[model samples]
Target: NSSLPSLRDVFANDFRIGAAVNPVTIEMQKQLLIDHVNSITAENHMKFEHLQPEEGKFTFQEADRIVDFACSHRMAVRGHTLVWHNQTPDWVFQDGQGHFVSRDVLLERMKCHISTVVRRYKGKIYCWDVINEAVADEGNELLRPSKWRQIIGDDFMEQAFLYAYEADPDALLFYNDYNECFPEKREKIFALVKSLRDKGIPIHGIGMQAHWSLTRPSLDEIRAAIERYASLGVVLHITALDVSMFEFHDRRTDLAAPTSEMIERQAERYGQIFALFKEYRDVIQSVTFWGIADDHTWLDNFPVHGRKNWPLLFDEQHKPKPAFWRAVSV
Candidate 1:
């Protein structure tokens, strides 16, 4: 552990090595980050609800701390989501009569929010996830029927990007989503971004929330996604990456912990994924792990409650796992 190579240094010529961290993680694992990562993304502090819990009041204590920490470390900070259906306060969509606000009213509110947040971080933040998960995965529609769509119509994405670009012209603005590599979802995301870019919107990049398991999202699918998105002529970011140890199903109640074989298999998977990322060094801008380590991963409680899933490169004690070695060796 004392002689472990810095991941940031290993991939210095390829792309930025990043991790999603909050104030707590920043405080607890400063050395772990400084030794391995060059980029920091505020996991939830930069989101809508945390930034502005109420309609007019803004909270900056936590988000400010995170940004300041990253800046002090000379790490690039990525602003997570200025506009999204979830984590936003309900008041933004409601009026005094508790009814959905008019399209004009909602757009005004969105403009105000984006302008304030983007302007505050102007030079410090390198990029912003201008919009998140707006594409529909299940339906034939291009955009999802989210509250933003329901109220502002299908042009909400365009309006959000326009507002963000106006606020911070130099920042790299991204459209981020999950399951983006799946064939059906990939086509929808491609069309969404192409339409925005064709109209000269400031959509600068695509965020592939590479949340996966060992058995799913085959490497070929991932390669295809990289190639297809690159054809659109936008940079790619592998955001929110974690490979779950267990194959999952929503209804399965199994409580099995990962065995030694499962851990080794994860190492091989990580090796393959990193090798693929290295192959596309020009198009890929950054790759951020969803969590810093397995001690507190979102995978532990997701898709099923109370399931302890080993899905990161480090163990609970902050020691590098086999996946960590395999990834760096790649």
Candidate 2:
């Protein structure tokens, strides 16, 4: 493991290399991170529900460990999320009577949660995904009709970013989303970020949640998405990267395990993707794998449940996979 080329060193001149981790991974694979990553993101410890499950009580034990570990290791910490459609507590949008709160009430709650979380680790965490998955993937509506939007309307995203900026002016703020590379979704995302910048929002970056599949999104599509997002003059971060073994809708449960051919194909796909990322390192400030390795990836039960997947660069045993070699060689 010591002989392996550190991924951070390979991409030192281009951009930072990172991994999303939880408490178990951080404790179990400390050296894996020291060897390969320069940045770390809390997979879920910093989300709204995890931070403040109730109204006024805030929990910082789990989140603190993540920040402390990153600080000790000199790895830049990316605060995962302040506001999002998912993973937020229902109490945030509901009154005592279980009715939806008014827009102002929701805004006040959002302001409190954001400021409290952002201010706690202002200097320790370098960036924040201020709002996550707000833009719509279907229909004509530009924003998703999540509870946040249903209660606070379309301006919820703007208000969240504003609150985050006020709390930590030095932190890089981002609007993160999935499926950003498809032609249709790409246009919607482009328009959304453009409007934010046009209104002088304090938004600083766009997180392309690069939860990609091996054979689905062509390199051309990804290139176009990066170029378009770059034109908006916002920094780009490959926030959550995992090359799923199956396509988005392919729910075939027959995948006992990734075949050797599948593993090689995944490596080739990673090679192409990282090479393109190197081309736009100026705008793409950081590229983070969604998980440290195939051992604990979210893809195992995602898109289809109970199917094992090999997505990241390292295998279950912490040994470097072909994908690791292909990606670092880029």
Candidate 3:
């Protein structure tokens, strides 16, 4: 059998091993992808802004490239986002004079955008993060005050889900967000998910981003969040994983290499987290690392601006780090 201890094999009976990728990453490390990942998501190209950069104009080139690559590789696609507050074009909320359009106009624009993008892929793509990061990271503001909400109000999310289904009824749609392990965000976001279901929206799954480090958001918290979300009868996508191990309490410099202890800690945690995922394999559809290799990690400049951080399974040499082995102890 050709099924080696690769990602596909290690979790073959469980859930898929997914990754965040763009054309550049895929081209630069094609072998790594073929061996390790079975589900793909466009890291940035599928976002609302990249798709529609100008008024009345739509570009599907980058996203199309990614989808074609995945299809050829026999890998499934996790269509990133149809609606998000970030990376969206300002024109979506503005008129010819640069004035904010009326609520009706903005809603109409959003409907068109969602339908256009989803209809293009339709049943070809696997699942879509139909709306990403719509809730506020802070308190009280249930929804982010983006143009979508400022004009279309909270119903913007509801309507986006409705429109996504109108375009691709067969494809699954998800609500994805970060900070889901945070207690307050979890509670409030759960209410939002419940509300959506209560209203009989076409929602399918909830994507809980695993943009975590070794020190924060204990494993128990991760388990609790998974249980709570899965209990809602929605398959959970534990996406965007990477374990950053250094600089927890201002302990290191930007150019510092991770100590041996840091590497060990990270790998152990990866194993533990993977074990947890195995426990809830029935609820989670996939667990995706943000990137395959450390050298290309988005965390390299995140938070600290220029700090090099190792948050993935492969190191600078493109070899699987202990974290990968530990995780797939399967």
Candidate 4:
């Protein structure tokens, strides 16, 4: 019925490429984004802080601009997060007395926030990071010291998912986190998701934040991780993926030399990772990076001070680096 190639053909034929855009005011960034990626992710660029900085005073100007830009280019938009412990308004937890609100009140606020945002962008967003960074690396339980845990305990995750489900039943909901590529964490996540699915929760997928270093990843490790999660009958997404070029030992120094070597190794890593995606592409929906360019990555300010962390596919000027071409070629 169609003369043109299918979307899958176009994607698979060209390595199924995509990128994450940094929060910037430059027009060139948007232009460059449309040029290389068919799928676009926001890097803290479209979170609660940007959407609603003050209590009860909501603003969608920045996020709306991003959505408009993506829609104009026909790019698949992946909303970064709906409920997270960090980047949340401080006032959310405090009452007029500066004391934490009761669990019932907090839950009401959570429901209102998620429902409003998700309903507005219901069908427009392809998927949502419904609950981001909720699980710890070990996956035994959520990390300690998180606001959600402090307020409503670990059950806050389930409450968040329930709220998101109520808001947009049709939208795909995912539990997103980093370091999921490792075996120790991967197994725990698979088990946890299976338990949730058995309980009839509305979770649709898992987001593996493939933030990898040069030396750490092994092909066998990746394949095992993918198969393990896919076995649970849940969709798999490689969200927030980027192999770093900076040395782990120090963040301030420009180890671009060793970082360049890491970039070379990425080709093999890319091949292995994508091969798994190809093997299980049926259950895998998307792969997204955290930022489009090295200059705009949050890693710069992540580990303290603005350090150089070369982890993305594009350079400062939005030029495709070797890693970019290599990834697409595979």
Candidate 5:
């Protein structure tokens, strides 16, 4: 700890240096968790389905454990995804006939659920991702036909933000999603935030999930989205920062490994992206990695089967990779 330049210390004036972790690593990686990260987000335990799997009955065991750890460590927490389309259990929308509940009934259920979770950690949680991934994928502008939207109309997000605000006025609220750099989706989200704010909803931030690979969306596009979203008067959170190191071109699902040279390239890329974040530090609230280590990364099983990915800043044994210095040198 004394030898390494602390990432949180480096970025303290710019943004909170954060990481997403589950219960096991919260205990196992206690040293690194305290050393590297100042803001903590539960990787999955705080999601809607896990917390409220059985209707009015709420589950708080794992979520509470994470929060307690963060509290004791004196780390700030970002409450992820008060409402999301995926990971949502069927029971939330079902009623007496196994059909969808009435709009009013669904709204009330959401109200109770959101209020309970938000209020439980009210001042403890510094931020909340009030609604997540509501818009369609691949540049589409339409909202997905989620159970929340289908029953409560597009105003579902409006209400969710409202309930979160009512529960915790001091916490910053965010609308979060992936593929947010796509043009139409970016515009649609900006418009949605505008409408909610115009209606007096307390929307304070936007979370752009930056699941980047080596190349694809141009840097200009990401910068443009940040600028446009900032125009709406909300802070920007760059969440889930990772770069896939799959063997491309000569591709196989079960790839061998990224070469030493490939890792240097990843380090260079990480440096460039951090430079951009520093450029917009005024509006960028916090930057959080999706996972802690190359071994523990979700990319190992995500959007691909039986594939290995080298994406995070630490190697399998918890040693800092070249990307770590590049990412934190700012």
Candidate 6:
């Protein structure tokens, strides 16, 4: 008879490791994707620009290649986003007069775009981040500054989700964003999701982009945030997870190794986060690294001007670090 396995043993093969891509056409990307990933997330697939780049001309070349690659590898694909303000084409709302499209026209355009994309890859995708970063940092309110909100009003999120459901009822729909594991913002998002669930909205999950700092909220605080969202009866996905070691004040070229004590602290930090995940593994579906190696991370280019940030599991040579092993061991 088989004995009960540890968390590590249970996830020995079930761990859904993944990486993100921008224009993934490199031969090395294909090889590494096959070697390390059982799942994949396109960094820009469901974004407005990639889907409906022009007024009426929808482009799917880059996205389709990513989808085909995932399919050929038998890997599960997580649609990065559907409704977002950024990365969207500017012509979406412009009329013949080059002004913002009317609200009625915008809504109709939204419906057509969502239906076409979702239906096109209905069964093939594992989950869809139906709406990305729509909520504000405070009060969990939908940001009113978005183009969709500017034209379609506050009900844009509802309409987007409804359209996606109508297009592909079987696909799991999610709301994804960064810093969502923090108490202030997380609580608001959770409340919004709970309200939606109670009202019979088709929202299925929450994607917490765990882009964390070395010292910020305690691990308990993070765990509490996860529990709060999970209690809403939706799957919690740790999407785009990475812990940075570069000091916020430093430049990318100034990256330094953690001292012995700091390394231990970081390791402990990683272990604690994973332990929380293991504790709630039933509701936590997947965890994805934003990039495979530190060399290619967006963090290196974010925040500070030309500052390097080591925030992933793999080293420069695609070798797994101790933190990666610790996470997997959990």
Clashing pairs in 2: none
* lDDT (0 to 1) per candidate: 0.90, 0.91, 0.85, 0.71, 0.85, 0.74
> How would the candidate models be sorted by lDDT, starting from the highest?
2, 1, 3, 5, 6, 4
Backbone clash pairs for candidate 4 read none
lDDT of 5 at 274: 86
The 10 consecutive residues of candidate 1 with the worst lDDT sum are 248-257
Query: Tens digits of per-residue lDDT for model 2 on 84-131?
Result: 888989899899999999999999999999989998998999999998
Leading candidate by TM-score? 2
Q: RMSD (Cα, Å) of candidate 4?
A: 3.9
Candidate 5 lDDT tens digits, 83-193? 998898899899988999989999999999999999998889989999998878753547776888988887888889888888989889999988788687888888888
List the lowest-lDDT window of 10 residues for candidate 2: 248-257
Residue 194 miss distance in model 2 (angstroms): 0.6
CA RMSD, predictions in order: 1.2, 1.0, 1.9, 3.9, 1.8, 3.9
> What TM-score would each prediction reach against the true structure?
0.97, 0.98, 0.96, 0.88, 0.95, 0.89
**Candidate 6 — which pairs collide?**
93-101, 251-307, 252-307, 252-308
Number of clashing pairs, model 4?
0
| lDDT computed for candidate 1 | 0.90
- lDDT by residue (1-330, candidate 3, tens digit) is 144368866898889998889989998878888988898888999998899898678999999999999889888888888888889888888898989999899878888888888888876687899888888899786877787888877788889899888888898889999889988888877989989999999999999888888876888888889988887889898778888775356545545688888889999989999999999988987988898888788887676667789889888888878888898884
How much does candidate 1 score in TM-score? Answer: 0.97
Per-residue lDDT tens digits for candidate 1, residues 152-258, read 98899999999999998999999999998899999999988999999998899999999998977999999999999999999999989999876756435575767
Off by over 4 Å in 1: 250-256
Model 6 Cα displacement at 76 (Å)? 0.1
Candidate 5 residues lying further than 4 Å off, grouped into runs, are 247-251
